[PDB]
Amino acid sequence: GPHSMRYFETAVSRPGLEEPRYISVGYVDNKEFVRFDSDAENPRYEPRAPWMEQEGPEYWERETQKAKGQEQWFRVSLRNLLGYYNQSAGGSHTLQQMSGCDLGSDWRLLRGYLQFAYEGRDYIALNEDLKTWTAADMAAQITRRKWEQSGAAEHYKAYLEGECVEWLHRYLKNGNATLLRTDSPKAHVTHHPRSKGEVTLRCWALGFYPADITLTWQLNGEELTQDMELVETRPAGDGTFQKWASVVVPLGKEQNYTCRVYHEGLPEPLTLRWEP
């Protein structure tokens, strides 16, 4: 088991809205686990998984305070971005941030992430070295300099190597039952006759976590990028996921067609075909 933590922050300005709305969402192993929202009647970080109600109110006060500081930081940053891009007033704008760390199965640090986006587009990001910055846009160079000048990278580096890691370990223990495993998928093939002499074999995969999964149809051993049909992986809404892949098939000549399904909770991949 390798692991991760992330914090996805967003601030949105809308043309007449007074102040931007700030929203921060924490993820441990891709599962939402805390959340702050400035629109809430009383803005505070709330827990979002059972295992987090294990945390004493001093924790929630500190975090909630950080949030209020972040809210102000996004405010000022949004304001400067307007100027950097020579945008006038009365438009909609978005500033986003992803921050966090990845751990090996040894629980050591693998990568730190620190990235920003403006209007949904990459604006500036801390490189893997955690010392240098990437920023494509001409307007973004102003920021790259201000932050090179001021040792911003060392600050974010410290968080990413210390606090991000230390606290992720702590969170990992405190719900060491909730996350330890993964829900394998259950598969089956459905039959749908369509045109004269042709059928749709649609291989489903249901009730799996996490979402990463691959589905492949084989003609006896030969895979198909030749007009196989799929859908983006989608949540069932119960905390598990669904995907299907289908292909065009001669009616009758249909046991030559094997769907394979690959997922991490699987001991080994599933081979299936149509069972009437």
């Binding site: 702050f36 949030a67 930081w73 400067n80 971005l81 500033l95 921050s99 920003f116 604006y123 606090e163």
Partner: peptide, 9 residues
Amino acid sequence: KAPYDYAPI
């Protein structure tokens, strides 16, 4: 722990 940012953008 949420991170906290250095200087604004």
